[PDB]
Enzyme design. Structure first.
Site, PDB file in Angstrom:
ATOM      1  N   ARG A  45      -1.529   8.057  10.938  1.00  9.10           N
ATOM      2  CA  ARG A  45      -1.806   7.100  11.994  1.00  9.10           C
ATOM      3  C   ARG A  45      -1.127   7.557  13.274  1.00  9.10           C
ATOM      4  NH1 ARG A  45       0.402   2.454   7.900  1.00  9.10           N
ATOM      5  NH2 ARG A  45      -1.426   2.384   6.517  1.00  9.10           N
ATOM      6  N   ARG A 138      -3.436  -4.172  13.795  1.00 10.09           N
ATOM      7  CA  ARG A 138      -3.104  -2.756  13.817  1.00 10.09           C
ATOM      8  C   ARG A 138      -4.330  -1.859  13.660  1.00 10.09           C
ATOM      9  NH1 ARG A 138       0.515  -1.108   8.630  1.00 10.09           N
ATOM     10  NH2 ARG A 138      -1.454  -0.763   7.515  1.00 10.09           N
ATOM     11  N   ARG A 149      -7.216  -3.008   0.507  1.00 12.93           N
ATOM     12  CA  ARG A 149      -5.804  -3.343   0.666  1.00 12.93           C
ATOM     13  C   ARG A 149      -5.580  -4.843   0.547  1.00 12.93           C
ATOM     14  NH1 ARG A 149      -2.453   0.421   3.519  1.00 12.93           N
ATOM     15  NH2 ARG A 149      -3.477   2.462   3.723  1.00 12.93           N
TER      16      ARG A 149
HETATM   17  N1  LIG Z   1       8.018 -10.619  11.041  1.00 11.37           N
HETATM   18  C1  LIG Z   1       6.872 -10.150  11.583  1.00 11.37           C
HETATM   19  N2  LIG Z   1       6.108 -10.934  12.375  1.00 11.37           N
HETATM   20  C2  LIG Z   1       4.963 -10.482  12.924  1.00 11.37           C
HETATM   21  N3  LIG Z   1       4.488  -9.238  12.732  1.00 11.37           N
HETATM   22  C3  LIG Z   1       5.156  -8.348  11.958  1.00 11.37           C
HETATM   23  C4  LIG Z   1       6.413  -8.764  11.323  1.00 11.37           C
HETATM   24  N4  LIG Z   1       6.857  -7.702  10.620  1.00 11.37           N
HETATM   25  C5  LIG Z   1       5.963  -6.693  10.790  1.00 11.37           C
HETATM   26  N5  LIG Z   1       4.950  -7.082  11.589  1.00 11.37           N
HETATM   27  C6  LIG Z   1       3.781  -6.266  11.997  1.00 11.37           C
HETATM   28  O1  LIG Z   1       2.890  -6.163  10.885  1.00 11.37           O
HETATM   29  C7  LIG Z   1       2.311  -4.862  10.828  1.00 11.37           C
HETATM   30  C8  LIG Z   1       2.553  -4.252   9.452  1.00 11.37           C
HETATM   31  O2  LIG Z   1       3.937  -3.925   9.327  1.00 11.37           O
HETATM   32  P1  LIG Z   1       4.356  -2.584   8.533  1.00 11.37           P
HETATM   33  O3  LIG Z   1       5.857  -2.465   8.632  1.00 11.37           O
HETATM   34  O4  LIG Z   1       3.481  -1.485   9.098  1.00 11.37           O
HETATM   35  O5  LIG Z   1       3.818  -2.975   7.058  1.00 11.37           O
HETATM   36  P2  LIG Z   1       3.883  -2.043   5.735  1.00 11.37           P
HETATM   37  O6  LIG Z   1       4.829  -0.949   6.151  1.00 11.37           O
HETATM   38  O7  LIG Z   1       4.422  -3.014   4.711  1.00 11.37           O
HETATM   39  O8  LIG Z   1       2.475  -1.557   5.379  1.00 11.37           O
HETATM   40  C9  LIG Z   1       2.974  -4.027  11.902  1.00 11.37           C
HETATM   41  O9  LIG Z   1       2.056  -3.881  12.988  1.00 11.37           O
HETATM   42  C10 LIG Z   1       4.161  -4.847  12.366  1.00 11.37           C
HETATM   43  O10 LIG Z   1       4.375  -4.684  13.769  1.00 11.37           O
HETATM   44  N1  LIG Z   2       3.343   4.906  -5.986  1.00 14.30           N
HETATM   45  C1  LIG Z   2       3.630   5.298  -4.718  1.00 14.30           C
HETATM   46  N2  LIG Z   2       3.237   4.526  -3.701  1.00 14.30           N
HETATM   47  C2  LIG Z   2       3.496   4.896  -2.425  1.00 14.30           C
HETATM   48  C3  LIG Z   2       4.192   6.058  -2.157  1.00 14.30           C
HETATM   49  N3  LIG Z   2       4.305   6.160  -0.802  1.00 14.30           N
HETATM   50  C4  LIG Z   2       3.702   5.076  -0.272  1.00 14.30           C
HETATM   51  N4  LIG Z   2       3.212   4.315  -1.269  1.00 14.30           N
HETATM   52  C5  LIG Z   2       2.539   3.017  -1.158  1.00 14.30           C
HETATM   53  O1  LIG Z   2       1.180   3.177  -0.833  1.00 14.30           O
HETATM   54  C6  LIG Z   2       0.720   1.972  -0.153  1.00 14.30           C
HETATM   55  C7  LIG Z   2      -0.040   2.379   1.087  1.00 14.30           C
HETATM   56  O2  LIG Z   2       0.827   2.933   2.075  1.00 14.30           O
HETATM   57  P1  LIG Z   2       0.332   3.108   3.577  1.00 14.30           P
HETATM   58  O3  LIG Z   2      -0.986   3.833   3.417  1.00 14.30           O
HETATM   59  O4  LIG Z   2       0.178   1.685   4.086  1.00 14.30           O
HETATM   60  O5  LIG Z   2       1.429   3.886   4.262  1.00 14.30           O
HETATM   61  C8  LIG Z   2       1.973   1.127   0.116  1.00 14.30           C
HETATM   62  O6  LIG Z   2       2.108   0.122  -0.891  1.00 14.30           O
HETATM   63  C9  LIG Z   2       3.106   2.133  -0.062  1.00 14.30           C
HETATM   64  O7  LIG Z   2       4.333   1.553  -0.456  1.00 14.30           O
HETATM   65  C10 LIG Z   2       4.591   6.831  -3.242  1.00 14.30           C
HETATM   66  O8  LIG Z   2       5.232   7.881  -3.068  1.00 14.30           O
HETATM   67  N5  LIG Z   2       4.307   6.439  -4.495  1.00 14.30           N
HETATM   68  F1  ALF Z   3       2.002   0.536   5.881  1.00 17.35           F
HETATM   69 AL1  ALF Z   3       1.559  -0.197   4.299  1.00 17.35          AL
HETATM   70  F2  ALF Z   3       1.158  -0.903   2.709  1.00 17.35           F
HETATM   71  F3  ALF Z   3       3.165   0.220   3.633  1.00 17.35           F
HETATM   72  F4  ALF Z   3      -0.045  -0.656   4.950  1.00 17.35           F
HETATM   73 MG   LIG Z   4       3.964   1.131   6.051  1.00 20.45          MG
END
Ligand SMILES: Nc1ncnc2c1ncn2[C@@H]1O[C@H](COP(=O)(O)OP(=O)(O)O)[C@@H](O)[C@H]1O
Ligand SMILES: Nc1nc2c(ncn2[C@@H]2O[C@H](COP(=O)(O)O)[C@@H](O)[C@H]2O)c(=O)[nH]1
Ligand code: ALF
Ligand SMILES: [Mg+2]
Length: 195
Positions: A45, A138, A149
């Site tokens: 991304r 996002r 997802r």
């Molecule tokens: N407490 C919150 N309130 C509103 N938006 C949030 C909060 N925490 C995270 N976000 C937003 O939600 C989106 C997903 O967060 P992210 O950390 O990328 O999720 P994940 O890593 O679990 O896939 C991001 O764009 C982030 O800016």
């Molecule tokens: N099992 C496994 N899941 C992962 C690993 N790295 C990221 N993920 C998971 O894959 C999912 C998608 O991640 P994202 O594509 O949003 O970064 C999230 O639930 C994240 O925690 C990994 O090394 N092993």
């Molecule tokens: F960035 Al993720 F699940 F960790 F969408």
């Molecule tokens: Mg993430």
């Protein structure tokens, strides 16, 4: 390798706030934590950096490393491969830092079967609607993978209630509150690592 402090496994649905919380933790406590850089076959991304967020590799490279025995665990998630290489964790342990892993629910179950003995933390949205709002605001994903997802989020949201699965469940309503509860869960380890 079992040397070094107790690792931390962070899981929860896509869009729940895992990366945002972990980035904050690694910024504030960079001297005691280190991030396990997973491999993935998904595309980066905007803003993601190879070797920091993930090792972004092709399926052919990922498969060759899997076949070689290079991974602690791997999983398929929303059409792409993800995995924790042995060297990703060993590099952090070698530095005597607390290794933090960000993995899906399959990864949690995979790691339960290893000798890593981590603390397991689940980070959850206040609701699925907030989650979808956050994911779409996002828009890094196609509609197809947003669908996958959101489905995986519901399926894994339910398992966060499974007794004994997670040590702590944090609802990320307010980021400041969730981050305080993250550090609360790790407060004893943080204090030990500092002394
Ligand atoms: N407490 C919150 N309130 C509103 N938006 C949030 C909060 N925490 C995270 N976000 C937003 O939600 C989106 C997903 O967060 P992210 O950390 O990328 O999720 P994940 O890593 O679990 O896939 C991001 O764009 C982030 O800016
Ligand atoms: N099992 C496994 N899941 C992962 C690993 N790295 C990221 N993920 C998971 O894959 C999912 C998608 O991640 P994202 O594509 O949003 O970064 C999230 O639930 C994240 O925690 C990994 O090394 N092993
Ligand atoms: F960035 Al993720 F699940 F960790 F969408
Ligand atoms: Mg993430």
């Amino acid at each position: 390798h079992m040397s070094g402090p107790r690792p931390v496994v962070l899981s929860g649905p896509s869009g729940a706030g895992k990366s945002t919380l972990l980035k904050r933790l690694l910024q504030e406590h960079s001297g005691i934590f280190g991030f396990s850089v997973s491999h993935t076959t998904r595309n980066p991304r905007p803003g993601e950096e190879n070797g920091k967020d993930y090792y972004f590799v092709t399926r052919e490279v990922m498969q060759r490393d899997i076949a070689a025995g290079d991974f602690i665990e791997h999983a398929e998630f929303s059409g792409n491969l993800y995995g924790t290489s042995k060297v990703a964790v060993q590099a952090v342990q070698a530095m005597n830092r607390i290794c933090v892993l960000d993995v899906d629910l399959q990864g949690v179950r995979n790691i339960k079967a290893t000798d890593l003995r981590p603390i397991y933390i689940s980070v959850q949205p206040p609701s699925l609607h907030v989650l979808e709002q956050r994911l779409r605001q996002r828009n890094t994903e196609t509609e197809e993978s947003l669908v996958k997802r959101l489905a995986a989020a519901q399926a894994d949201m339910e398992s966060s209630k499974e007794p004994g699965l997670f040590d702590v469940v944090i609802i990320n309503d307010s980021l400041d509150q969730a981050y305080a509860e993250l550090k609360e869960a790790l407060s004893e380890e943080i204090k030990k690592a500092q002394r």
